[PDB]
Amino acid sequence: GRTVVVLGGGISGLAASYHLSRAPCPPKVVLVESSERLGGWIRSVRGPNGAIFELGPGGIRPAGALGARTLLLVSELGLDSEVLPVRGDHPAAQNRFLYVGGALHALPTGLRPSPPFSKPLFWAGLRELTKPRGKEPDETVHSFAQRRLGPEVASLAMDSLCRGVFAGNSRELSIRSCFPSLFQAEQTHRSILLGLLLGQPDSALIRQALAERWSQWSLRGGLEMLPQALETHLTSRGVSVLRGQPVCGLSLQAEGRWKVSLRDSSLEADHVISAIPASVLSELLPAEAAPLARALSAITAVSVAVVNLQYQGAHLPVQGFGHLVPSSEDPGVLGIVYDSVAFPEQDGSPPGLRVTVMLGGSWLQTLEASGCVLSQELFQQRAQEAAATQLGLKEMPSHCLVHLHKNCIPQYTLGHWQKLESARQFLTAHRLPLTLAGASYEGVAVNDCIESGRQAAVSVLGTE
Ligand SMILES: Cc1cc2nc3c(=O)[nH]c(=O)nc-3n(C[C@H](O)[C@H](O)[C@H](O)COP(=O)(O)OP(=O)(O)OC[C@H]3O[C@@H](n4cnc5c(N)ncnc54)[C@H](O)[C@@H]3O)c2cc1C
Ligand SMILES: O=C(O)c1cc(Oc2ccc(C(F)(F)F)cc2Cl)ccc1[N+](=O)[O-]
Structure with missing residues (x-):
C-alpha cells in the first residue's frame, strides 16, 4: 500500500x-x-571483432568499505564467474603515468628525485606536517594542494588527479567535497599525512579481492x-x-x-x-x-568526449593503467586509458590494442559555448593526435568510437x-x-x- x-x-x-x-x-x-x-x-559497446569498448567507467576500484560493498552486490547478483579482476601482481595495477614535457613519467608508490619533480617528494611530505591549517569552511583543490604540498605537486599531481576523477578544474573544485578524507585529515589532525597514518562487509569474492589485491575489476561482457x-x-x-x-x-x-x-x-x-x-x-x-x-x-556538470581507438598489431611504450595529462600540458585531453593492459580478454580477435582517450577540460567547455560544430571528426583528430603524440602510435586506428557526453560529471x-x-x-x-x-x-x-x-x-x- x-x-x-x-x-x-x-x-x-x-x-x-x-x-x-x-x-x-x-x-x-x-x-x-x-x-x-x-x-x-x-555503458559498453560490443564491437565487431568481439572487443568491448567502455563508454563510461571501464572498471571499478574495489579498495575501501565502499569498494567492498560493491563486490558484495556483485556476489548477490551472481556475477562472480563473470568478473575480470586486475591483480596486485600486474603493471596495470602498479603503474599510473603523467604526460609532462613530451614524455610519460611514472608516479611513485612508496619508494630520489622523480621526474617531473625537481626534488625528492619526501621533502613536500615534510613541510606538510609542519604546515598550518586552513580556517575557511571550504577551499579549492588547487588552493589546498598548493598550500600544503607546494607549487610543483599542486600544478602537476593534484591538477591531473582532479582531471582523472572529476574531469574537472582543481581551481574550481572544493577540497571538502572532492577529497573529503584529505580535508578531514588536515582539519582533524592538522596534517594530511598524519590523518592517514592515524586511520567492511565480507564474502568469498571480497576475501579473494583482498588476498589477490585487486586494484580494479570489471565484467567480461563489460561493466x-x-x-x-x-x-x-x-x-x-x-x-x-x-x-x-x-x-x-x-x-x-x-x-x-x-x-x-x-x-x-x-x-x-x-x-x-x-x-x-x-x-x-x-x-x-x-x-x-x-x-x-x-x-x-x-x-552543474562538465562534458566529456570519450574516444575509443583500436590498433591492429600495435604496442605501448609502457605498461600501466593509463596516463593522465595535466591541464598545462593539454586543455582538451584529460588522460588515456590502456584497456588492453588491464583487460586483454576484451581485446576481441583478431586481438587489437585498445586505448580510451578522455577529452574535455576548457577546450571542450569553450567549444560548447561557441558557434562551432561538435563533429565526430573534431574529437577523432584530437584523440588520434594525442595517441600519436603521447603514445607514439602513428598507425591509423583500425577501429574508432566517438561519444560526446553532455553534462555527465557533476562538479563540486x-x-x-x-x-x-x-x-x-x-x-x-x-x-x-x-x-x-x-x-x-x-x-x-x-x-x-x-x-x-x-x-x-x-x-x-x-x-x-
Ligand atoms: C566517461 C566517464 C568515465 C567514468 N569512469 C568512472 C570510473 O571508472 N570509476 C567510477 O567509479 N566512476 C566513473 N565514472 C563516473 C560514474 O560513472 C558516474 O558518476 C555514475 O555512473 C553516475 O550515476 P548516476 O546514477 O548518479 O547518474 P546517471 O548515470 O547519469 O543516471 C541518471 C539517469 O536519470 C535519467 N533521467 C534524467 N531525467 C529523467 C527524467 N526526467 N525522468 C526519468 N529519468 C531521467 C537519465 O537518463 C540517466 O540515465 C565515469 C564517468 C564518465 C562519464
Ligand atoms: O586515475 C585515473 O582516474 C586515471 C583516469 C584516466 O582516464 C580517465 C578516466 C575517467 C575520467 C573521468 F571519468 F573523469 F572522465 C577522466 C580520465 Cl582522464 C587515465 C589515467 C588515470 N590514471 O590514474 O593514470
Whole structure:
C-alpha cells in the first residue's frame, strides 16, 4: 500500500530500487527512466571483432568499505564467474603515468628525485606536517594542494588527479567535497599525512579481492553487465521500470502524496527517490519548493568526449593503467586509458590494442559555448593526435568510437557543502517525502553512487 517512485535509471536509481525491493516487507517500487536504456553513464559497446569498448567507467576500484560493498552486490547478483579482476601482481595495477614535457613519467608508490619533480617528494611530505591549517569552511583543490604540498605537486599531481576523477578544474573544485578524507585529515589532525597514518562487509569474492589485491575489476561482457543484472533482478522481484518516460513535473497534493508527471500519464508516490541530475530535478520542482530548486540548480556538470581507438598489431611504450595529462600540458585531453593492459580478454580477435582517450577540460567547455560544430571528426583528430603524440602510435586506428557526453560529471565547486546543507534543511524543515541521491550530491564514483542508492533506500524503509 506504500508506493515509492525512483527517478532515473542510472546506477544510483538502480541500486536504490534494488535495496528497496529486497526489504522483508517491500513497498511497491516504480523505476522511471527517461531514456530507452537503464544504466545511465555506465555503458559498453560490443564491437565487431568481439572487443568491448567502455563508454563510461571501464572498471571499478574495489579498495575501501565502499569498494567492498560493491563486490558484495556483485556476489548477490551472481556475477562472480563473470568478473575480470586486475591483480596486485600486474603493471596495470602498479603503474599510473603523467604526460609532462613530451614524455610519460611514472608516479611513485612508496619508494630520489622523480621526474617531473625537481626534488625528492619526501621533502613536500615534510613541510606538510609542519604546515598550518586552513580556517575557511571550504577551499579549492588547487588552493589546498598548493598550500600544503607546494607549487610543483599542486600544478602537476593534484591538477591531473582532479582531471582523472572529476574531469574537472582543481581551481574550481572544493577540497571538502572532492577529497573529503584529505580535508578531514588536515582539519582533524592538522596534517594530511598524519590523518592517514592515524586511520567492511565480507564474502568469498571480497576475501579473494583482498588476498589477490585487486586494484580494479570489471565484467567480461563489460561493466554494463552490472546495470543489466540489476535490471533483471528488479524485473524478477516485480519492480516496475518505465523506459522512454521522462518525468515532466513533481507536485504534492492532499494526504501529502506525490504526483509524478509523465509525458501524458501520472503516478502517485508516497515517497520519491530522485536519482537524476540535480539540475534536472531543479526544473521538475513546484514553485512551492523554490529555495530547494535554487540550491539544486547551483550544481552543474562538465562534458566529456570519450574516444575509443583500436590498433591492429600495435604496442605501448609502457605498461600501466593509463596516463593522465595535466591541464598545462593539454586543455582538451584529460588522460588515456590502456584497456588492453588491464583487460586483454576484451581485446576481441583478431586481438587489437585498445586505448580510451578522455577529452574535455576548457577546450571542450569553450567549444560548447561557441558557434562551432561538435563533429565526430573534431574529437577523432584530437584523440588520434594525442595517441600519436603521447603514445607514439602513428598507425591509423583500425577501429574508432566517438561519444560526446553532455553534462555527465557533476562538479563540486566551492560552496557545494552549503548547497547540500540547504537542500537538506528545506527537505526536512517542510517534511517533504523526497530523498536525494546520485552523483550530484556526495560522490561521482560508481561505488559512491551505489552506496548513495542504498542509503536512500534504507532511509525510505525507515519511514513507513
Ligand atoms: C566517461 C566517464 C568515465 C567514468 N569512469 C568512472 C570510473 O571508472 N570509476 C567510477 O567509479 N566512476 C566513473 N565514472 C563516473 C560514474 O560513472 C558516474 O558518476 C555514475 O555512473 C553516475 O550515476 P548516476 O546514477 O548518479 O547518474 P546517471 O548515470 O547519469 O543516471 C541518471 C539517469 O536519470 C535519467 N533521467 C534524467 N531525467 C529523467 C527524467 N526526467 N525522468 C526519468 N529519468 C531521467 C537519465 O537518463 C540517466 O540515465 C565515469 C564517468 C564518465 C562519464
Ligand atoms: O586515475 C585515473 O582516474 C586515471 C583516469 C584516466 O582516464 C580517465 C578516466 C575517467 C575520467 C573521468 F571519468 F573523469 F572522465 C577522466 C580520465 Cl582522464 C587515465 C589515467 C588515470 N590514471 O590514474 O593514470
